[PDB]
């Protein structure tokens, strides 16, 4: 209908239900898996991420959004082979994940060239099946937009433009770096509730992040129990003073899982167990959540 | 015995043969092609390297090198696939091509954790197979030696150290990198004599290219096709010169061929520098001691 599925027909904009936006069943170094497959198991990854999806279903979970692409190791076979064990609703994207250079294939050549490969992606189909991408992922971190990272920012405008479909964002909360995709996004021509900028809630900050959502953009409290950077206790302070100023439009909440002495609590269902239960105890009715976790990609894939 | 070779058992390092010591039957970028399949051709890919290959056995090559590791889509699969349709010597390699940073897989990671995967491919296997690793190769350009980079080639010298295979190395001959290259190594207790700096034939200046060769290290003039780093009559100008100044012993020459720069083949050494070498007063003994015995004592 709108936005496609990983082993499954096409559905509407409005049947992605309670949705979690930013989550990786596994995520890899291509290379380095291609090379030395001997330290991946590939039975292991597939069980780990069965028995998390199924879980978060359970708490009601109907749609996941996995923005897993080229430098995190997407492999649609490993989706829909998930899929078919869980019966989820999978939306794969495209897009390419970098912080400083790309690889020397892209070397000296067109930026539309780079667009066309997430074309291919969301029109052709993903590594040779039919699996369509519905997003586009792009990235920024400590270095932040270089001549190389502000390419990909640029081919996935185009993309957004050629196909409509929306821009999740990796970026680092500290640097500035989540306005600048915005402002180089919104001066492409991407309509500013077409982007989700993420990795802000791992920031106390509060100014940086209305900024962004006063112009038009998704906010990305989306790393709930990576508590090295900022711990479950400060993220869930921080989303309800955000709820409660108002910015619940714009609220898009999510772990950033990948399927320990440190990485405490964090889980796909973690947001369960601790955040809502959190937000209901400080007043905020399941018409507040419902916004977050159902309107809100309701209308990002709109 | 001594040198494992791909769909083959190992040989000893007196069996070289005149040997390419650097050429690579396939490279690409995994993140790409594991990503795009439809981008590629795994058949024409293989027919080009097939004609390629036999066309450089047909000139008398018993060895090729391929320098193919991580960042570059190094793939036995396809190398045997290609060794089963030739009979030729193929000697696969293990280690990390990158300019900058390295995968984020290897983040607050112990650089002898790399190394450890080095000496995996080196004494395990490959790939999941048993086809070993007879070298290291590490790379280093215009960036320099990043602190990444810096891991990367004090790793080869923990495997070098470990299995005494040797290491190729890919620099940048404007920027001083592969003297850098060669100072961390032997600083690192790395034989001098096991290590070639290569891609140094892309330059004019023979004193920089002397200065590494006489601190015991093995010069790659290794980039014979490729124009747009020189010309093929200013590599010939410049290979003569170092062996009227007694450099033979530790010269080696190869295309970097990848199945403007038009000639550009893995057989463009035999139609144009050895034919152009000798006609100007080099013996049938120097050129195989470039060919035969510089390979035979950099992997002995
Ligand atoms: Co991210
Ligand atoms: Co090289
Ligand atoms: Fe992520
Ligand atoms: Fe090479």
Redo the contacts with the bound molecule.
Sequence with gaps: MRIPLVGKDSIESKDIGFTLI?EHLRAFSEAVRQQWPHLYNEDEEFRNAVNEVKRAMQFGVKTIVD?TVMGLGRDIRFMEKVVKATGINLVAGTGIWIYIDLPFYFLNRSIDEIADLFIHDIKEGIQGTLNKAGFVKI?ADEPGITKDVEKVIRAAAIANKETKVPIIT?SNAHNNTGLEQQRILTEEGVDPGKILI??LGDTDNIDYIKKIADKGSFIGLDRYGLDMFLPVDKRNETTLRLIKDGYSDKIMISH?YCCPKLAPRWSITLIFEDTIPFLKRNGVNEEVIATIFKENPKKFFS
Excluded: E, L, M
């Design positions: 930013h923005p990235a990796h993420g990795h950033d």
